Amino acid sequence: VSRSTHLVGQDGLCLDVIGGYSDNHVPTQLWPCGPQNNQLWTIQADGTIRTMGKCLVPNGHDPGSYTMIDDCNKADPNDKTWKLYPDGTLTHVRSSLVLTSQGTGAYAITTIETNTSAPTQSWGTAD
Ligand SMILES: CC(=O)N[C@@H]1[C@@H](O)[C@H](O[C@@H]2O[C@H](CO)[C@H](O)[C@H](O)[C@H]2O)[C@@H](CO)O[C@@H]1O
């Protein structure tokens, strides 16, 4: 079943669409957690992760590719399919790369990177 949640990463900050804008290609970052819609993510059985009607996708499939939101219908399965493991690893299924934070200061855009089991690579769910 789909579950709506916050995605909580390094230092208890939340995955956040910068500025709250739902336009295609707006990047994601870490931001102090709050009730705003751009921090509410729906994990679906189809493998997508959605906010504001859009899908989390990397802009590419290589280490260091940033993540952003995009139209779920302007995305192929490779772009939009993720798997959140119980230990916190959030894997981009096609590439096997993992969602990785790049700082807790403002506008630190998240990327997909080779898994190093870093503290920047562990994502928890919370109501
Ligand atoms: C036009 C304008 O100034 N809009 C802003 C919003 O963009 C802003 O939304 C927040 O932006 C931060 C990043 O700076 C986070 O993404 C946060 O989750 C958003 O809520 C709001 C609040 O600062 O202020 C204006 O509305």
Author numbering: 6 to 132
Sentences reproduced from the published study:
Here, we report the discovery and characterization of Cucumis melo agglutinin (CMA1), a new R-type lectin from melon. CMA1 comprises 291 amino acids and is predicted to fold into two linked β-trefoil domains belonging to carbohydrate-binding module family 13 (CBM13) and placing it into the group of R-type lectins. In contrast to other R-type lectins such as ricin, it lacks a catalytic domain.
Finally, in the presence of 20% PEG 8K, 0.2 M MgCl2, and 0.1 M Tris HCl pH 8.5, single diamond-shaped crystals were obtained after 1–2 days for the N-terminal domain. High-resolution diffraction of the crystals allowed us to solve the CMA1-Nter structure in complex with LacNAc at 1.3 Å and GalNAc at 1.55 Å (see data and refinement statistics in Table 1). All residues of the N-terminal construct (Val6 to Asp132) could be modelled, and unambiguous electron density permitted us to locate and model four cation binding sites (three in each structure) and one sugar binding site. However, only the alpha site was found occupied with a carbohydrate here. We report a tight coordination of the O3 and O4 hydroxy groups of the galactose residue involving Asp21, Asn43, and Gln41 side chains, as well as the Gly24 main chain nitrogen. CH−π stacking and hydrophobic interactions occur between the aromatic ring of Trp36 and the alpha face of the ring as well as the hydroxymethyl moiety of the galactose residue, additionally ensuring specificity for galactoside over glucoside as an equatorial conformation of the O4 hydroxy group would lead to steric clashes and loss of strong hydrogen bonding. Notably, the seemingly inactive beta site was found to be occupied by a cadmium ion, supporting our ITC and SPR data where no multivalent binding effects were observed for the single-domain N-terminal construct.
